[PDB]
Design an enzyme around this catalytic site. Structure first.
Site, PDB file in Angstrom:
ATOM      1  NE  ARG A  37      -3.594   2.428   2.452  1.00 15.12           N
ATOM      2  CZ  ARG A  37      -3.750   2.935   3.621  1.00 15.12           C
ATOM      3  NH1 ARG A  37      -3.417   2.431   4.736  1.00 15.12           N
ATOM      4  NH2 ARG A  37      -4.371   4.150   3.831  1.00 15.12           N
ATOM      5  CG  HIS A  41      -1.819   4.994  -1.195  1.00 18.71           C
ATOM      6  ND1 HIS A  41      -2.426   5.758  -0.114  1.00 18.71           N
ATOM      7  CD2 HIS A  41      -2.299   4.297  -1.603  1.00 18.71           C
ATOM      8  CE1 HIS A  41      -3.519   5.206  -0.077  1.00 18.71           C
ATOM      9  NE2 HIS A  41      -3.651   4.233  -1.077  1.00 18.71           N
ATOM     10  CG  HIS A 162      -7.775  -4.591  -2.966  1.00 19.52           C
ATOM     11  ND1 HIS A 162      -8.710  -3.943  -3.637  1.00 19.52           N
ATOM     12  CD2 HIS A 162      -6.702  -3.728  -2.549  1.00 19.52           C
ATOM     13  CE1 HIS A 162      -8.419  -2.517  -3.381  1.00 19.52           C
ATOM     14  NE2 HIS A 162      -7.214  -2.468  -2.729  1.00 19.52           N
ATOM     15  CD1 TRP A 178     -10.991  -6.895  -1.527  1.00 16.71           C
ATOM     16  CD2 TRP A 178      -9.410  -6.391   0.055  1.00 16.71           C
ATOM     17  NE1 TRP A 178     -10.881  -5.473  -1.436  1.00 16.71           N
ATOM     18  CE2 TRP A 178     -10.010  -5.070  -0.446  1.00 16.71           C
ATOM     19  CE3 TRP A 178      -8.313  -6.346   0.684  1.00 16.71           C
ATOM     20  CZ2 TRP A 178      -9.702  -3.816  -0.167  1.00 16.71           C
ATOM     21  CZ3 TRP A 178      -7.994  -5.060   1.235  1.00 16.71           C
ATOM     22  CH2 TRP A 178      -8.691  -3.718   0.870  1.00 16.71           C
ATOM     23  CG  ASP A 207     -12.566  -4.504  -4.660  1.00 13.85           C
ATOM     24  OD1 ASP A 207     -11.447  -4.359  -5.014  1.00 13.85           O
ATOM     25  OD2 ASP A 207     -12.754  -4.353  -3.193  1.00 13.85           O
TER      26      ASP A 207
HETATM   27  C1  HEM Z   1      -8.475   0.390  -7.483  1.00 13.48           C
HETATM   28  C2  HEM Z   1      -8.675   1.539  -6.940  1.00 13.48           C
HETATM   29  C3  HEM Z   1      -8.260   1.330  -5.293  1.00 13.48           C
HETATM   30  C4  HEM Z   1      -9.141   1.580  -4.494  1.00 13.48           C
HETATM   31  C5  HEM Z   1     -10.362   2.623  -4.549  1.00 13.48           C
HETATM   32  C6  HEM Z   1      -8.400   1.126  -3.111  1.00 13.48           C
HETATM   33  C7  HEM Z   1      -8.802   1.508  -1.837  1.00 13.48           C
HETATM   34  C8  HEM Z   1      -8.216   0.744  -0.710  1.00 13.48           C
HETATM   35  C9  HEM Z   1      -8.722   0.905   0.400  1.00 13.48           C
HETATM   36  C10 HEM Z   1     -10.072   1.980   1.060  1.00 13.48           C
HETATM   37  C11 HEM Z   1      -8.091   0.284   1.547  1.00 13.48           C
HETATM   38  C12 HEM Z   1      -8.249  -0.049   2.936  1.00 13.48           C
HETATM   39  C13 HEM Z   1      -7.413   1.073   3.762  1.00 13.48           C
HETATM   40  C14 HEM Z   1      -7.543   0.555   5.301  1.00 13.48           C
HETATM   41  O1  HEM Z   1      -8.599   0.724   5.585  1.00 13.48           O
HETATM   42  O2  HEM Z   1      -6.617   0.146   6.060  1.00 13.48           O
HETATM   43  C15 HEM Z   1      -6.925  -0.351   0.719  1.00 13.48           C
HETATM   44  C16 HEM Z   1      -6.119  -1.391   1.015  1.00 13.48           C
HETATM   45  C17 HEM Z   1      -5.222  -1.870   0.410  1.00 13.48           C
HETATM   46  N1  HEM Z   1      -4.799  -1.784  -0.936  1.00 13.48           N
HETATM   47 FE1  HEM Z   1      -6.155  -0.527  -2.287  1.00 13.48          FE
HETATM   48  N2  HEM Z   1      -7.415   0.733  -3.472  1.00 13.48           N
HETATM   49  C18 HEM Z   1      -7.128   0.563  -4.736  1.00 13.48           C
HETATM   50  C19 HEM Z   1      -6.177  -0.080  -5.711  1.00 13.48           C
HETATM   51  C20 HEM Z   1      -4.944  -0.484  -5.138  1.00 13.48           C
HETATM   52  C21 HEM Z   1      -3.725  -0.983  -5.735  1.00 13.48           C
HETATM   53  C22 HEM Z   1      -3.571  -0.467  -7.372  1.00 13.48           C
HETATM   54  C23 HEM Z   1      -2.954  -1.689  -4.892  1.00 13.48           C
HETATM   55  C24 HEM Z   1      -1.639  -2.101  -5.212  1.00 13.48           C
HETATM   56  C25 HEM Z   1      -1.154  -2.714  -6.418  1.00 13.48           C
HETATM   57  C26 HEM Z   1      -3.598  -1.548  -3.703  1.00 13.48           C
HETATM   58  C27 HEM Z   1      -3.115  -2.303  -2.633  1.00 13.48           C
HETATM   59  C28 HEM Z   1      -3.794  -2.268  -1.251  1.00 13.48           C
HETATM   60  C29 HEM Z   1      -3.351  -3.134  -0.171  1.00 13.48           C
HETATM   61  C30 HEM Z   1      -2.343  -4.143  -0.274  1.00 13.48           C
HETATM   62  C31 HEM Z   1      -4.329  -2.982   0.878  1.00 13.48           C
HETATM   63  C32 HEM Z   1      -4.376  -3.604   2.159  1.00 13.48           C
HETATM   64  C33 HEM Z   1      -3.339  -2.788   3.252  1.00 13.48           C
HETATM   65  C34 HEM Z   1      -3.354  -3.435   4.530  1.00 13.48           C
HETATM   66  O3  HEM Z   1      -3.566  -4.582   4.625  1.00 13.48           O
HETATM   67  O4  HEM Z   1      -2.983  -2.614   5.447  1.00 13.48           O
HETATM   68  N3  HEM Z   1      -4.864  -0.940  -3.689  1.00 13.48           N
HETATM   69  N4  HEM Z   1      -7.093   0.009  -0.709  1.00 13.48           N
END
Ligand code: HEM
Length: 249
Positions: A37, A41, A162, A178, A207
């Site tokens: 993440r 970001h 995810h 997820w 998603d």
């Molecule tokens: C497609 C548009 C995307 C949206 C709207 C989105 C949104 C989010 C949100 C809301 C979270 C939860 C954060 C939390 O509450 O801790 C999250 C977590 C995460 N995102 Fe996405 N994301 C997107 C794309 C991506 C991409 C492109 C990647 C990397 C290739 C990614 C990797 C992750 C990972 C690994 C988590 C888990 C973080 C954790 O376990 O602490 N996401 N994302």
């Protein structure tokens, strides 16, 4: 369309030793999803029209960490700082993108190629470039396509990140993983997405938007059926993301 910069041999050696230290640290601390993440970001703020933002070290600045999309990443920055200090020659930009590559590797994902040489830039981008989880397919194309310059295939593959990790109600407000194996990088994000909502597990509106779009949906079906193809397209997409604005846009 890339032309990578030359770095010294000492820089190259540091990259190789840092990759090994990062593997052990990330595995031990169980924080791969968080590091992935952080890299995402860091990179996802790039805008090709103005050539601002992207993976240039700025996410460590207090002004960028306060962006609301970045709730929780201050933890990730703090976690990596003592390790960064062992590698003073590396840019933070490179170090954080390398952390992201290693996070995919140590959870069992593809080996994403990595080229060094990003410079740390002083000015953080403006808030609001990262995507909104409550929006749909049009928004995703605005952000990944129009801003970052990635393809529709890249959007679906990258969403598959995810497959590791979870949301936290104290950070974004969404809650839960997820997948049922959130420390294993596999294609189960796409398989959970198809079979529908399941108690215990999370689906964002963003998603779900993948399932309803004419172009995205065939890619979802392909990746649910063929992990090998997902891994191939994912590695390609992650590399491009990690290199936005670097060594030519
Ligand atoms: C497609 C548009 C995307 C949206 C709207 C989105 C949104 C989010 C949100 C809301 C979270 C939860 C954060 C939390 O509450 O801790 C999250 C977590 C995460 N995102 Fe996405 N994301 C997107 C794309 C991506 C991409 C492109 C990647 C990397 C290739 C990614 C990797 C992750 C990972 C690994 C988590 C888990 C973080 C954790 O376990 O602490 N996401 N994302």
């Amino acid at each position: 369309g890339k032309s990578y910069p030359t770095v010294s041999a000492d820089y190259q050696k540091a990259v190789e030793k840092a990759k090994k230290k990062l593997r052990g640290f990330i595995a031990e601390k169980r924080c791969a999803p968080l590091m992935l993440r952080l890299a995402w970001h860091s990179a996802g703020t790039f805008d090709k029209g103005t050539k601002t933002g992207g993976p240039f070290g700025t996410i460590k600045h207090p002004a960028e960490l306060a962006h609301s999309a970045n709730n929780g990443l201050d933890i990730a920055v703090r976690l990596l700082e003592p390790l960064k200090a062992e590698f003073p020659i590396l840019s933070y930009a490179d170090f954080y993108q390398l952390a992201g590559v290693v996070a995919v590797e140590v959870t069992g994902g593809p080996e994403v190629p990595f080229h060094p040489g990003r410079e740390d830039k002083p000015e953080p981008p403006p808030e609001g470039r990262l995507p909104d989880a409550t929006k749909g397919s049009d928004h995703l194309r605005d952000v990944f396509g129009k801003a970052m310059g990635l393809t529709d295939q890249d959007i679906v593959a990258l969403s598959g990140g995810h497959t590791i990790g979870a949301a936290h109600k104290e950070r974004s407000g969404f809650e839960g993983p997820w997948t049922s194996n959130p420390l294993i990088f596999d294609n189960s994000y796409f398989t959970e997405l198809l079979s529908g909502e399941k108690e215990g597990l999370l689906q964002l509106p963003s998603d779900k938007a993948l399932l309803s779009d004419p172009v995205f949906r065939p890619l979802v079906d392909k990746y649910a059926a063929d992990e090998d193809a997902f891994f191939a397209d994912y590695a390609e997409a992650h590399q491009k993301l990690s290199e936005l604005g670097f060594a030519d846009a």
